[PDB]
Design a protein around this ligand. Structure first.
Ligand SMILES: [Mg+2]
Ligand SMILES: [Zn+2]
Ligand SMILES: [Zn+2]
Ligand SMILES: [Zn+2]
Lengths: 573, 49, 98, 73, 378, 65, 601, 56, 77, 49
């Protein structure tokens, strides 16, 4: 094992080979792995208490004369899989290495993933809070890609003024998050304000919103193809004539050009036609198959792309952009797992201000901070205030970040309180607040969970063909499901008439003819205007019974399963 | 039975009917590991490792 | 070419849609792991054999009776280890022992 | 007036009951032809109901969306 | 006001018997402290009667659905995972009427001769606890020169087991007649009589080591705790019938975790009481406050037919008279086909069937009947 | 992708002095002293100027028409 | 096939018969609104203009419905559809809105927009209990979010971190009447599960009540008038000032709080702030001796830990979770039981606004110095940690030398593990006590933890002193390499630090190994929750299907649909658990005390 | 004799349904109210004609 | 010997008379098949010497009402 | 992203929890919520395959 390790360190053999030694009184085994799928990490080789990495190697790396592969080649740094690491003894820090140590950790902060490194000071937060912050880091909005306008993504978001965090880890610069930020720095004051920020809710300044803070644009791309059918039939890109079937209306084609394509920079609403298309009839005039905006969505047409598919058919892609000014119900989350929707938009005159002339952009309730054990948020606020005052960004890397006490000392030296508390005045009364309010700069991210895309209201509309029940989804104007648990609470409340109105009257109410002789479903003949039971007869004793259409479907399924349900009718009174 | 033995019992040894000594030796190694774990000679294997 | 320089790549475009393959954390192929089932009171070793994309679960288990058993795919019931040892070419008991 | 369901009696359908309650006999496996019209004697025969809006049921005389459908055998 | 007058007024008042005694005791306690008058006592009695009338539950309440919701909702905040394993698995096992609960625990009480001193409790526990040969042995070694298994035991566990060496060798010799047992020093030597095959040695070696030398079957671990100046014995494993007829054990307060053993030994009513007690104890340990009326309703529904029944497809739901209610819960095809075979008739007297059809449910406002005189004018 | 015209907090105009601030920062000057010399006193305006990242030039290269 | 179309979650029974999608429903994100009553819900204008309620034209509402028809679907308040007595539906547009309006008569149906005072169903999923759906009153708001009052959140278990809720509009008169009578919010203040308050005050209300009613809290005339106007209390003249400071009158917070209580209410108990029982003992003795103590005598020995209300006047004590909190509010529970649900609803609506005004303008905040500790406290915590580590090392050495005594029923390894865990738990408790010693009542986080508003003392302990021992499945961390959780520790090391004992705190900063251990613990907790939820739901469904048909008959018995008597009397006493006093039939002592006080006062 | 919540709800629903399709109000009511509000006012005035049949 | 009724979990069991059973049936307006059932092999039944067809009056120890009366009908195994 | 072939509905208590061998290979904090907790993982920043 020692000879193989020495040969690998000398560069005689490849670095993919990993060797491990297993020693025991009963068994003695040596394992060598050189296959695929092994996840390894680099470690600095430590020999007799001295690491192999010296200052000369660092100088060569900085000067550019040495690369990482060169460092791997000399055996200074080696990749260790899980099997080889069983025999290793890694020191966490360079000043903690001894003669017993066999390896030295390169960067303890590198054990986290890319989204997990976005959180500043993760060691000062609870683990579930760090998990939530890592999860919500992928839901933020910002300048993700510079070529967003030419892309044809189905959904897209764009923050108008993205900002690099003032408190950020050094890994974020190397990863590339600083070039493509997804949030803004918010002046946040921890204060209870009129009960509108309780239960994780937040309060946002009206003037800040009107000045462009957290402004976002939502993109949606629609596509239309001039499909070709058998026999030479094909779709046509033109404004449909009023005489054709399926005509939506005159006002729905007001934005269409003579080629059937919508003009760019045209304001559109729900069910507005973007591409005018017609289709050949089935088994008459041509039908209408135009591509329209979603009923609950609106915006302005951004671009129109005219191209062809792989089969030569015409392809038209239309992108619609909608301005998303923050409002009530818009989800906002910090990097430390603190999330909540906007509870109230408060004018700047009513908002409190400090003795230095600082008005918070956001107000968070103090009740949410200590219960979740989030000290990293307070440290980030202090660091953001210090960075704004000094002009130098505060490093927030894990385990090597700027100490909290240093930030407090810098804040005290800058002329502010060490604790970050400032004297604030009430916006409405104008009097001094009895307590010094903690206020700082916290990086806040706007998430894609917007109330504009979540509000759904259905009264009546399309139903499923099979069950005669309301459809599913906001795009298809569907209804809300009244599940088994909802029926359970309705039963527990003792509301029988409410249950009848919900499950039967408003969902699938229908009437059927039931034969009173054999219990079979009678047949109504519209030709002769008579109702009779085909299996048994009984042209007279036929009664109409109302029930859910789902029950009729169940009866049909039971009959198809060679099961005869006999409905015994009873008088209402 | 011959087809099942050739194409199902340790295919990574091979499907050629000649390659049966290797399958027998691998099964013997498996039995040795089982007996070592049962008699306390060796410890359990961590699946999550 | 209309591409963002910061795009890392590493994905596929299928019919105009970006598809990314997610790595699967599977067990080590052709590796035998021994485990003890306390509820069933048995010792079972399992290996996953790979050959041209085909995976077969070969299981060697020993019950409370002290008799080893071999589980083979396309066989509805477990069979004895000695029977497989005999059918695999080892006739005499000396070869099976050695 | 109106009547409600008092009780439901279950059982096994007899072949005679299946024959009597059937509106048509199905023997052609094919459903639709090249033109898209339903095939007489097929599974989508108009005697069993209508799905297409322009179609008319031969047993009920009603249009799609209000014809309850009819069993075959 | 004399106590006789207060007692007469309490008896004359319309109240339950348990309320009457508590009210009389409270009135007696408050009479000497504040010198209550007759009118004050009468007003107190009237207020108590009014409060009792107000607390009565109105007819038509969906008590079963409310009980199910009030039991299931606290289970959404329960915690998963000596060796008592309470929590959501415990309540799941209780409501599912598991025949053998995981880690059974038997609570054993002692009479007046053993509940005061620790030595009597220890010897009662060692009598209850089942000790076999495999736990007493330090190591297992198969010997081939004598062609028989050899057993050695440590002195500490042998001394604590309460039986000496002679008791051990008399126990195996009487129970096993195929082979004889010889002993010297602190070692067991077994000698065969007609055993020659090596394979037959293993089948007789395992049978010897698993034979129970003393105690009750199914009990392997026993601990003793002190509470309320009394000694209570807690054992691992449940053998209620055997432990009931054991000297030095009080059978009036002895109970077990297994509700099936309670039903088999004590009765169905005792099984219902044990189910109620187990659910209440689990809820109290989890820190969730649940009214006992829901628990007693669940236990009464569980033991309606004289046997313990689960709440799943094999229990209360399985024996429901409604075909549609049975088919809607878990098994649809099997229940419907079984009803078709028997020609079952569903009277639609339940709630689920009326929900499915679209008829008013027989609960809440569904049971209210209205009448009105037609000649009505403003 | 472009510098905001006004500070998001108090509405103070900062876009006029942003390019001078960026030019002086890239020349090796202390950003705090540059902000002080430009009249940027409150740290909210300093937050707006320091945390802004210019990205419009990376968007202009892609034509939409 | 046919079998798969009937069984399963997506089958005909569960997916279409027992539960199905419904019409006249809406769903959007919820936002807080303390200004509306607990009986009201904020409905968006767009939602209100889409959802319609069919109202028949009668003699007393012909003009209103005619105006609704004339307004049209694009003008609020208007209508979308009109149904003639013949039964046909006519859509309303600009061309025919006048013709329909002049054709309106008795018997027509007008599908007008949602207006203020309408009854709708408000539901949050999952519906674990019957309080998950309640009937509210419609309040129309311009924005796009639902608005729910904060005290109604605990019944729904709803927060405002992106929660969405469903709204249902009943269409028939019988359904509307059933929702208005049975399912109103104020009718379900007391939870039937445990017979205690469920619709109660929460964190900010509790903190504001404590700030208002604590000792030394005084307010000026302007503040008192402003909070009275904000809370909506019907007060026309201020009471006599309690004291004068610098020539300006001042009012005690207890005096302002006493305006909420009824004039004939008397109750005394011990709250969560009682840390000196010797001070409550004198108050209890004074109350017991006389039963009508003088108000001046009570105020002389008043204590914040003992709350005493006499004839609606808060003579002593402070407001906390025991006042009107969920599952612990004695005052709210007494108000519900002795004054009805409408009086309780008014009291809750007034007190929430009053406490919100008090906490808003006084200033409540938390900062980084709330978890700060002096150097002596940190030194004591470090000494405790070092002593615990030394004890663990001594136990390990004793186990290695064989001197460790095995515990009954366990071997050496489990005995050593139990001893180590007990030592670490004792060290954590000692560190928590040391931290609690130096955190006074002036700290806002300590106020929140002690009053029961939000958080616990342990939460402050973790950030201040130390985190403690990280464990999964009730055992110390062991999953990793051979003999060690991490490579950075030596193999075979059974010490505290190598097994998941975090000596650092959140403020001090966790080491990478401690970070990994805390991540393991958090992952275990998240996995436990995500596994427990499914089993709890399955058990709830099984119980619901087992006990769906049981109900109380007119004779007090509970019977199955067949007719078999399950209980000859529900609960063996015929008492609703919702109306039961702490699980008992009748609270005799409370009735006796209240009647005696009423007759002697 | 006192009305239960279910009985009161059923009576109010029946009265509101009657008012919706005829059945003029027996007491003076303010203009612009719903039939449910009229039924609630009638119940508050104690003028309802609908009785409850109970088992005996 | 240890009586089965001395246990704290076992309530008092008493066999109802014919007139008492008829009065119980008349009071609740139920048939003999609408009562809760108890097996003939139950320890309480074999301790009381009852036979299938009888009704057992059970005096439960009610946590809420103090004493509660329950009735069970003896049925064959 | 790294995923596991195990079923999401089953509680894999031994597989969902963070292992000691995930140091430097699997991110300890970035995991999804719900059935994917502990079964869907992400590569560490220092991880090499
Ligand atoms: Mg939430
Ligand atoms: Zn017929
Ligand atoms: Zn038809
Ligand atoms: Zn500014």
């Amino acid at each position: 094992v020692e000879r193989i390790r020495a040969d690998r360190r000398a560069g005689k053999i490849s670095d993919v080979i990993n060797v491990a030694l297993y020693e025991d009184e009963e068994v003695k085994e040596v394992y060598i792995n050189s296959d695929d799928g092994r996840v390894r990490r680099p470690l600095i080789v430590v020999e007799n208490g001295k690491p192999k990495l010296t200052r000369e190697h660092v100088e060569g790396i900085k000067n550019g004369t040495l690369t990482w592969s060169d460092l791997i080649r000399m055996g200074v740094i080696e990749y260790l899989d899980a099997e080889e690491e069983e025999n290793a003894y890694v020191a966490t820090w360079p000043w903690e290495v001894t003669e017993e140590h066999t390896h030295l950790e390169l960067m303890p902060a590198a054990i986290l993933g890319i989204p997990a490194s976005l959180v500043p000071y993760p060691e000062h937060n609870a683990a579930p809070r760090n998990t939530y912050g890592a999860g919500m880091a992928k839901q933020s909005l910002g300048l993700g890609w510079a070529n967003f306008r030419i892309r044809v993504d189905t959904r897209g978001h764009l923050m108008h003024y993205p900002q690099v965090p003032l408190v950020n880890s050094r890994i974020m610069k190397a990863v590339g998050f600083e070039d493509r930020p997804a949030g803004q720095n918010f002046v946040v004051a921890v204060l209870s304000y009129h009960g509108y920020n309780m239960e994780d809710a937040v309060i946002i300044n009206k003037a800040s919103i009107e000045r462009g803070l957290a402004r976002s644009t939502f993109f949606r791309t629609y596509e239309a193809e001039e499909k070709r059918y058998l026999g030479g039939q094909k779709d046509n890109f033109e404004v449909p004539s009023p005489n054709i079937q399926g005509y939506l209306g005159e006002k729905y084609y007001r934005h269409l050009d003579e080629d059937g394509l919508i003009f760019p920079e045209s304001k559109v609403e729900g069910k507005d036609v973007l591409v005018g298309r017609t289709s050949p009839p089935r088994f008459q005039g041509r039908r209408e198959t135009s591509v329209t905006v979603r009923p609950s969505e609106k915006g302005v047409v951004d671009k129109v792309i005219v191209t062809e598919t792989g089969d030569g058919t015409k392809l038209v892609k239309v992108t619609v952009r909608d301005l998303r000014i923050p409002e009530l119900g818009d989800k906002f989350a910090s990097r430390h797992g603190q999330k909540g929707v906007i509870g109230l938009i408060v004018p700047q005159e009513d908002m409190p201000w400090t003795e230095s002339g600082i008005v918070p952009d956001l107000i968070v309730n103090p009740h949410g901070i200590p219960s979740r054990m989030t000290v990293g948020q307070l440290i980030e606020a202090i660091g953001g205030k210090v960075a704004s005052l000094t002009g130098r960004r505060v490093d927030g890397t894990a385990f090597i970040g700027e100490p909290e006490e240093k930030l407090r000392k810098e804040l005290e030296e800058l002329g502010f309180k060490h604790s970050g508390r400032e004297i604030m005045y009430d916006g409405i009364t104008g009097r001094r607040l009895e307590a010094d309010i903690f206020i700082g700069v916290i990086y806040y991210q706007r998430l894609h969970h917007m109330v504009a895309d979540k509000m759904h209201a259905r009264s009546r509309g399309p139903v499923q063909v099979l069950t005669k029940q309301p459809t599913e989804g906001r795009a298809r104007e569907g209804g809300l499901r009244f599940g088994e648990m909802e029926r359970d609470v309705l039963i527990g409340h003792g509301a029988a008439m409410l249950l009848i109105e919900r499950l039967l009257e408003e969902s699938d109410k229908t009437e059927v003819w039931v034969c009173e002789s054999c219990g079979h479903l009678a047949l109504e003949d519209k030709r002769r205007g008579k109702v009779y039971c085909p299996v048994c007869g009984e042209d007279e004793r036929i009664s109409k019974v109302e029930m859910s259409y789902a029950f009729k479907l169940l009866l049909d399924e039971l009959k198809a399963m060679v099961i005869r349900p006999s409905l015994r009718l009873k008088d209402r009174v | 039975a011959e087809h099942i033995i050739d194409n199902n019992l340790l295919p990574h040894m091979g499907v050629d009917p000649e390659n049966r000594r290797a399958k027998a030796y691998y099964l013997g190694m498996m039995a040795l590991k089982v007996l070592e774990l049962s008699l306390g000679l060796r410890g359990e294997d961590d699946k999550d490792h | 070419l209309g591409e963002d320089p910061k795009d890392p790549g590493g994905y596929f475009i299928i019919n105009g849609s970006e598809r990314v393959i997610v790595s699967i954390e599977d067990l080590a192929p052709n590796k035998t792991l021994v485990e003890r089932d306390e509820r069933q009171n048995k010792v079972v070793a399992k290996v996953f054999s790979y050959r041209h994309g085909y995976r077969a679960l070969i299981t060697v288990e020993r019950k409370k009776d002290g008799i080893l058993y071999v589980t083979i795919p396309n066989v509805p019931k477990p069979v004895k280890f000695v029977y497989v040892m005999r059918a695999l070419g080892l006739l005499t008991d000396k070869e099976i022992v050695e | 007036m109106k009547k409600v369901i008092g009780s439901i009696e279950f059982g096994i359908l007899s072949p005679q009951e299946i024959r009597k309650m059937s509106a048509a006999e199905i023997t052609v496996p094919d459903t639709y032809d090249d033109d898209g019209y339903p095939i007489e004697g097929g599974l989508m025969d108009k005697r069993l109901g209508v799905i297409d809006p322009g179609l008319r049921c031969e047993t009920c005389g009603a249009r799609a969306g209000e014809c309850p459908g009819h069993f075959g055998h | 006001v004399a106590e006789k007058t207060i007692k007469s007024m309490v008896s004359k008042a319309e109240l339950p018997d348990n309320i009457k005694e508590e009210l009389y005791a409270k009135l007696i306690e408050y009479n000497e402290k504040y010198k209550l008058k007759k009118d004050e006592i009468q007003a107190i009695i009237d207020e108590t009667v009014r409060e009792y009338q107000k607390a009565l539950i109105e007819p038509g309440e969906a008590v079963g659905t409310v009980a199910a919701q009030s039991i299931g909702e606290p289970s959404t905040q329960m915690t998963l995972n000596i060796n008592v394993t309470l929590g959501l698995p415990r309540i799941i096992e209780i409501v599912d009427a598991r025949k053998n609960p995981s880690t059974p625990i038997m609570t054993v009480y002692l009479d007046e001769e053993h509940r005061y001193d620790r030595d009597k409790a220890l010897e009662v526990a060692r009598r209850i606890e089942g000790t076999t040969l495999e736990n007493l042995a330090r190591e297992e070694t198969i010997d081939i020169l004598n062609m028989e298994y050899v057993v050695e035991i440590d002195p500490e566990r042998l001394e604590k087991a309460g039986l000496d060496m002679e008791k051990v060798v008399r126990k195996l010799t009487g129970s096993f007649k195929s082979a004889e047992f010889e002993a010297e020093g602190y070692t067991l030597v077994v000698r065969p009589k007609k055993v020659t095959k090596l394979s037959d040695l293993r089948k007789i070696a395992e049978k010897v080591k698993k034979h129970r030398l003393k105690g009750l079957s199914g009990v392997g671990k026993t601990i003793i705790r002190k509470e309320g100046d009394e000694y209570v014995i807690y054992t691992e494993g449940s053998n209620f019938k055997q432990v009931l007829k054991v000297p030095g054990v009080d059978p009036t307060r002895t109970r077990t975790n297994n509700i099936w053993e309670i039903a088999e030994v004590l009765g169905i009513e005792a099984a219902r009481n044990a189910i109620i007690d187990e659910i209440v104890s689990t809820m109290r340990e989890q820190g969730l406050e649940v009214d006992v009326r829901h628990i007693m309703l669940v236990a009464d529904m569980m033991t309606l037919d004289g046997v313990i029944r689960p709440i799943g497809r094999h229990g209360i739901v399985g024996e429901k008279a409604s075909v549609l209610a049975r088919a809607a819960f878990e098994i649809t095809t099997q229940h419907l086909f079984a009803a078709a075979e028997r020609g079952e008739v569903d009277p639609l007297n339940g709630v689920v069937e009326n929900v499915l059809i679209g008829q008013p449910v027989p609960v809440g406002t569904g049971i209210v009947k209205l009448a009105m005189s037609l000649p009505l004018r403003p | 992708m472009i510098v905001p015209v006004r500070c998001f907090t108090c509405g103070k105009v900062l876009a006029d002095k942003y390019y001078e601030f960026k030019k002086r920062v890239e020349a090796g000057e202390d950003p705090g002293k540059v902000l002080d010399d430009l009249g940027v006193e409150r740290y909210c305006c300093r937050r707006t100027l320091l945390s802004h990242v210019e990205l419009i030039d990376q968007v202009m290269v892609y034509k939409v028409y | 096939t046919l079998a798969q179309r009937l069984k399963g979650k997506e089958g005909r029974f569960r997916g279409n018969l027992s539960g199905k999608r419904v019409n006249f429903s809406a769903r959007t994100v919820i936002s807080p609104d303390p200004m509306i009553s607990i009986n009201e819900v904020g409905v968006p204008l767009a939602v209100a203009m889409e959802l319609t309620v069919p109202e028949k034209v009668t003699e007393f509402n012909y003009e209103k419905l005619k105006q609704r028809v004339l307004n049209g679907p694009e003008k609020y308040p208007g209508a979308n559809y009109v149904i003639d007595p013949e039964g046909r539906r006519i859509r309303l547009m600009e061309s025919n809105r006048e013709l329909i309006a002049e054709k309106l008569d008795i018997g027509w149906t007008v599908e007008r927009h949602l207006e203020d005072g309408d009854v709708v169903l408000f539901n949050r999923q999952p519906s674990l209990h019957r309080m998950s759906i309640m009937a509210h009153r419609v309040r129309v708001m311009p924005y796009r979010t639902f608005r729910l009052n904060l005290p109604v959140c605990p019944p729904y278990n709803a927060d405002f971190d992106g929660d969405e809720m469903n709204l249902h509009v009943p269409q028939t008169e019988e359904a509307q009447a059933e929702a208005k009578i049975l399912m109103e919010v104020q009718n379900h203040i007391i939870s039937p599960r445990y017979g205690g308050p469920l619709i109660a005050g929460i964190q900010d209300h509790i903190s504001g009540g404590y700030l208002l009613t604590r000792e030394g809290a005084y307010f000026t005339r302007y503040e008192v008038e402003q909070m009275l106007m904000f809370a909506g209390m019907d007060v026309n003249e201020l009471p006599e000032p309690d004291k004068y400071e610098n020539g300006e009158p001042l009012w005690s917070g207890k005096t302002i709080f006493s305006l909420l209580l009824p004039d004939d209410l008397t109750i005394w108990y011990r709250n969560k702030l009682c840390d000196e029982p010797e001070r409550c003992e004198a108050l209890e003795k004074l109350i017991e001796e006389k039963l009508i103590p003088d108000p001046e005598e009570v105020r002389k020995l008043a204590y914040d830990g003992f709350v005493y209300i006499q004839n609606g006047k808060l003579l002593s004590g402070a407001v906390d979770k025991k006042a009107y909190g969920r599952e612990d509010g004695k005052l709210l529970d007494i108000i519900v039981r002795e004054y009805g649900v409408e009086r309780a609803r008014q009291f809750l609506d007034q007190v929430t606004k009053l406490t919100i005004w008090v906490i808003t303008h006084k200033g409540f905040t938390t900062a980084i110095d709330d978890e700060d500790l002096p150097q002596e406290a940190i030194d004591r915590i470090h000494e405790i940690i070092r002593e615990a580590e030394e004890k663990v090392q001594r136990l390990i050495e004793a186990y290695k030398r064989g001197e460790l005594e095995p515990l009954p029923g366990k071997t050496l390894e489990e005995t050593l593990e139990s001893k180590i865990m007990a030592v670490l738990a004792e060290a954590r408790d000692n560190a928590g006590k040391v931290a609690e010693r130096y955190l006074g009542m002036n700290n806002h986080a300590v106020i929140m933890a002690k009053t029961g508003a939000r958080g616990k003392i342990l939460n402050i302990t973790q950030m201040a002193a130390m985190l403690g021992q990280q464990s999964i499945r009730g055992k110390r961390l062991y999953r990793g390499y051979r003999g060690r959780v991490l490579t950075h520790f030596k193999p075979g090391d059974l010490g505290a630090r190598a097994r998941g004992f975090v000596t650092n705190s959140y403020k001090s900063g966790l080491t990478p190994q401690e970070y990994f251990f805390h991540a393991m613990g958090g992952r275990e907790g998240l996995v436990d929750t995500a596994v427990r939820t499914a089993q709890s739901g399955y058990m709830q469904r099984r119980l619901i299907n087992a006990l769906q048909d049981l109900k109380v008959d007119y004779d007090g018995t509970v019977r199955d649909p067949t007719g078999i008597i399950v209980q000859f009397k529900y609960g063996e006493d015929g008492v609703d658990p919702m109306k039961s006093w702490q699980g008992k039939t009748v609270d005799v002592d409370r009735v006796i005390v209240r009647t005696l006080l009423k007759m002697r006062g | 004799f006192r009305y239960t919540r279910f009985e009161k709800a059923r009576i109010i629903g029946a009265r509101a349904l009657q008012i919706a399709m005829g059945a003029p109000v027996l007491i003076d009511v303010p203009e612009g109210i719903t039939p449910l509000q009229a039924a609630l006012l009638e119940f508050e005035k104690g003028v309802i004609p609908i009785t409850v049949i109970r088992p005996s | 010997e240890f009586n089965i009724f001395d246990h704290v979990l076992v309530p008092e069991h008493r066999i109802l008379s014919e007139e008492e059973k008829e009065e119980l049936l008349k009071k609740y307006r139920i048939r003999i098949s609408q009562l809760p059932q108890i097996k003939a092999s139950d320890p309480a039944v074999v301790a009381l010497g009852a036979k299938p067809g009888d009704v057992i009056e059970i005096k439960r120890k009610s946590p809420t009402a103090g004493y509660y009366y329950y009735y069970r009908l003896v049925v064959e195994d | 992203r790294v995923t596991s072939p195990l079923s999401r509905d089953q509680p894999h208590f031994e597989a969902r929890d963070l292992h000691g061998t995930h140091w430097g290979r699997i991110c300890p904090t970035e995991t999804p919520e719900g059935p994917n907790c502990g079964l869907v993982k992400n590569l560490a920043l220092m991880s090499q395959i």
